[PDB]
């Protein structure tokens, strides 16, 4: 199977507590963690997946482990109130990826951005060239309400990698009512 370590990032920003995604984004992104942890389980047994809180202070409560049980426990009562912070959210998972015992696993990060961010374009392009030097491939899936047809995030994924690098894909929520399972139905079949 493919060798890599996937680090899932839940969105704890205060804008993620609304029930627009049925029944609530808390359970919606919980099912999103359910489908990414079960797919990586069906993908390779050697994949270890932790969680990271992006907004406010960034702390990983569950050390990187192949078992998602403790991750599912932290999905409940997470108290996702705070202001979204982007620039640190990728690097905090990058440090968790440098603590891996085995060096044969590729560095992989999946994050959810459900809130408008104040991150400047200079900061995301500095992280883009930094990830170019660090080879890390990040697959982001945009939830929630944000700038219509997100650009700085799309340009972030574009300028993140190149040639090929097969790759970083960005999935933005369509402007219409839908279930969270329908939003994650596309990435699970094809990245």
Partner 1 sequence: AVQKVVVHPLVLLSVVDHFNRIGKVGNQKRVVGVLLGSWQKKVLDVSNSFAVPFDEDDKDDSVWFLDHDYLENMYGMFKKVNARERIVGWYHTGPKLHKNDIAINELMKRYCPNSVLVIIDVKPKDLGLPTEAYISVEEVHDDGTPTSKTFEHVTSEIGAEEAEEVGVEHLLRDIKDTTVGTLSQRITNQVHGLKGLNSKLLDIRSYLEKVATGKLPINHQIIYQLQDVFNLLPDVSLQEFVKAFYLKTNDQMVVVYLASLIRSVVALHNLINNKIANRDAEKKEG
Least distance to partner 1 from the beta carbon of 61, Å? 9
Gap between the Cα atoms of 82 and 88, Å rounded:
14
Share in percent of the chain as helix, strand, coil (round to 5):
40, 15, 50
Q: Interface with partner 1 includes 160 (CB under 8 A)?
A: no
The residue range among 24-32, 83-91, 147-155, 183-191 that interacts with partner 1, by the rule CB under 8 A, is: 83-91
The answer for residues whose C-beta is within 8 angstroms of residue 179's C-beta and 6 or more apart is 21, 22
Which residue of 69, 76, 79, 98 would you call a contact of partner 1, by CB under 8 A? 98
Q: Interface with partner 1 includes 164 (CB under 8 A)?
A: no
* Residues 123 and 92 sit within 8 Å (Cβ to Cβ): no
Residues in region 112-151 near partner 1 by CB under 8 A: none
Residues in region 6-65 near partner 1 by CB under 8 A: 58-60, 63, 65
> 130 is written with which tokens?
């930094």
Q: Interface with partner 1 includes 106 (CB under 8 A)?
A: no
Gap between the Cα atoms of 66 and 168, Å rounded:
23
Q: Interface with partner 1 includes 107 (CB under 8 A)?
A: no
Binding residues for partner 1 (CB under 8 A): 58-60, 63, 65, 87-88, 91-92, 94-96, 98-99, 101
């Amino acid at each position: 199977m493919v060798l890599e370590s996937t680090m899932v990032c839940v969105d704890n920003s205060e804008y993620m507590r609304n029930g627009d995604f049925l029944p609530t984004r808390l359970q919606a992104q919980q099912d999103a963690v359910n489908i990414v942890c079960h797919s990586k389980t069906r993908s390779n047994p050697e994949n270890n997946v932790g969680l990271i809180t992006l907004a406010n202070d960034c702390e990983v409560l569950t050390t990187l482990t192949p078992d998602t049980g403790r991750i599912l426990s932290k999905l409940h009562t997470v108290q996702p109130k705070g202001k979204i912070t982007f620039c640190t959210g990728i690097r905090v998972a990058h440090l968790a990826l440098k603590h891996r015992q085995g060096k044969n696993h590729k560095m992989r990060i999946i994050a959810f951005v459900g809130s408008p961010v104040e991150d400047n374009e200079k900061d995301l392009v500095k992280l883009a060239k930094r990830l170019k030097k660090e080879k890390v491939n990040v697959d982001i899936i945009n939830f929630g309400e944000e700038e219509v047809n997100t650009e700085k995030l799309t340009a972030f994924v574009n300028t993140l990698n190149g040639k090929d690098g097969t790759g970083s894909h960005l999935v933005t929520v369509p402007p219409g009512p839908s279930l969270a399972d329908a939003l994650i139905s596309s990435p699970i079949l094809a990245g």
